[PDB]
Structure 1
């Protein structure tokens, strides 16, 4: 059933996943020396290319591939349109490895055919709390704690094959070459997410959406008017009213994050993320990179009163191309990023996120039910979507966890 995934060091079934009691590697121990120096073989009409994603023109080339060929729905109504500025931010965080950005071009004219990207992340991925209990009950605490130390691994994203080259087994070759490059740097695990079900997720969560511009969402068929609104003389008026938000934030002392906030934000974020089984560890430089405001990319606000930062939230922008509506070309989505609340309830913090996103012309706010996102779903009028996000590791056995035990946001 899986000619490629059956050959890789990942759990092969749910049944197998059910028998996993400790975090740890799947594959044989290996060294950099064991890994082929030469690129993985590829057909003579293609070549490997390493784009420089700090170079505008190379970012533009990858941007076009994704714009035209990246994830879309089944009815081909919307396709993600990650911006050039967003790609540079996502793919060049502190201490990234240029070699982990892998492309295929056709040798002749140099058309870009495929891409995959890895970036470093420092991740807590030791045995989860509920399994450390099981291990205590069995007298197996030492084995359960072996991999407790945060690990420097690879996060994979942006896998894409050109539409004209689909179902030709190019994706496996891209994955093998990426794994080689990562392994040549003495890194042996990766983390990735996908909507599709592959062997085998360690966690899955549904997507949730919060309408900000319902009239446009209905126009482009992102949304429909729910049946109950038909009992009203003016269904759309009632829908707009239902999703109306304040025009300015409600929390006193809300303001954009600045460089001087980085230590406080790192403190409160890392204290909060510790509570979850799987989550990132960020340095100051990583907090700066992922959270300082960046125009059209990432938006981050802190609550500061009486000279102390007590709370923050962040969101990032991913637009989508609206395929052949006559009124609109673009869907402007805000996604819930990291946050931490110490002074106010989470719903009160995130309401200000919706208010700012609406103020700035976003059409919808999206998120997965990771972190404590379920805690403000109903009050803030989010609803579940049809999509899931499944979380995977490469070369890491891991017990199934609930999505509310995952604290890694994947872009």
Structure 2
């Protein structure tokens, strides 16, 4: 609650509130020529390390660090378990910098004990498009917590981003920091009810016996949009047009190039699933979701919760409810146990009807070095990884 580090950074104070007409950096007229050229100082016996995410072995090291040390749910039952291949896709998007993929090693073990990453992306906030970094995967080894490593990681990636004449960033966290531009609850749609019950993800009452819970969450194996199919390279221009058009209504969204569309949407097994409805060689409807397993900590029977996370979903030929009903069936068809979605975009309107349950927390959206009015999650049009 003191935010001793955060309060030194160009982010709003916890009591700052800005008019709708304020939409600008906290610190303008920055100069690349003035940016520190020296790496930030690490504690004795630790070293910066530039990770090559395209090298299987370096990628494996980041994977291991995240598997053992990344985000857990509030009750420490689950831990996110991003796959190696997901990390490769997440970090090697168009115009990515290797030098924004930053490790820290303990010199004596040669072991990776900290990470932070960013990728470039054009972000439209309140109708101004700004070159930004999207920051993700900040992680410090569980054995080294509350030693103020995280601010060094932050300050070092800020410096390397600033060297590229980028002065804004976007990120998200579960934790409250100075100061969200928006705050979105997450919801879950049970698919394998029994499993989710057995692992303590979901529960039963005397009203809801096991057979009744299973029957509740039953879906028909038949698509509302019969032609919905895996996206193909030929669809890239059609998706770019459909998605790009739709995203303009929002207060915060990424501005995608065709190269970014192909990267972010072309399907990769166990990473990203995009489906399209093509009519007359035109893309009219799209569904997408990414795969993010959680490791189930100390359950005798199951080791992994497979989960699909709603990415971007646009319909022009069905209702948004029918579209999302199809997104659920498609995730069931891909052996997911649960479908997760944030109350962003049009999502919340379908949660009651599609039998989504409210989850235990929320995801806060932040900008660095940007001053603007905050807004309700309906007005958020971007989903980070």
For residue 85 of structure 1, report the CA deviation from its aligned partner. 0.5
Residue in 1 that maps onto 2:24: 24
Residue in 2 that maps onto 1:164: 143
Residue in 2 that maps onto 1:42: 42
Q: Which moved more, 1:174-183 or 1:98-107?
A: 98-107
* Pair 1:402-2:380 in alignment: no
CA–CA distance in 2 between the matches of 1:250 and 1:31? 54
* 1:74-129, Cα deviation, whole Å (9 max, x unpaired): 32210000000000001110111111111111122211110111011111013xxx
- Contact 1:248–1:356 (CA under 8 A) maintained in structure 2: no
* Pair 1:296-2:270 in alignment: yes
CA–CA distance in 1 between the matches of 2:246 and 2:106? 47
- Contact 1:124–1:279 (CA under 8 A) maintained in structure 2: yes
SS at structure 1 position matched to 2:24: coil
Of 320, 329, 337, the match for 1:363: 337
CA–CA distance in 1 between the matches of 2:158 and 2:128? 22
Residue in 2 that maps onto 1:278: 252
- Contact 2:190–2:356 (CA under 8 A) maintained in structure 1: yes
CA–CA distance in 2 between the matches of 1:68 and 1:113? 11
* Pair 1:237-2:211 in alignment: yes
- Contact 1:79–1:321 (CA under 8 A) maintained in structure 2: yes
How well do the aligned residues superpose, as a CA RMSD in angstroms?
1.3
* Pair 1:198-2:177 in alignment: yes
Residue in 2 that maps onto 1:376: 350
For residue 305 of structure 1, report the CA deviation from its aligned partner. 3.6
For residue 28 of structure 1, report the CA deviation from its aligned partner. 4.8
- Contact 2:225–2:318 (CA under 8 A) maintained in structure 1: no
CA–CA distance in 2 between the matches of 1:372 and 1:20? 22
For residue 311 of structure 1, report the CA deviation from its aligned partner. 0.4
Of 211, 221, 226, the match for 2:200: 221
SS at structure 2 position matched to 1:123: strand
Task: Show structure 2 runs of 5+ residues with no match.
Answer: none
Task: Show structure 1 runs of 5+ residues with no match.
Answer: 127-147
CA–CA distance in 2 between the matches of 1:272 and 1:304? 17
The number of residue pairs the alignment matches comes to 384
TM-score with structure 2 setting the length = 0.97
CA–CA distance in 1 between the matches of 2:342 and 2:220? 24
CA–CA distance in 1 between the matches of 2:242 and 2:159? 37
Of 230, 233, 241, the match for 1:256: 230
For residue 18 of structure 1, report the CA deviation from its aligned partner. 4.3
Q: How does 1:37-186 map to 2 (within 5 A)?
A: 37-126=37-126, 148-186=127-165
* 1:263-306, Cα deviation, whole Å (9 max, x unpaired): 11110101100010111111111000000110110001101245
SS at structure 2 position matched to 1:409: coil
CA–CA distance in 2 between the matches of 1:349 and 1:255? 13
SS at structure 1 position matched to 2:226: coil
SS at structure 2 position matched to 1:17: coil
Q: Which has the higher helix share?
A: 1
Residue in 1 that maps onto 2:316: 342
CA–CA distance in 2 between the matches of 1:96 and 1:18? 33
CA–CA distance in 1 between the matches of 2:37 and 2:382? 32
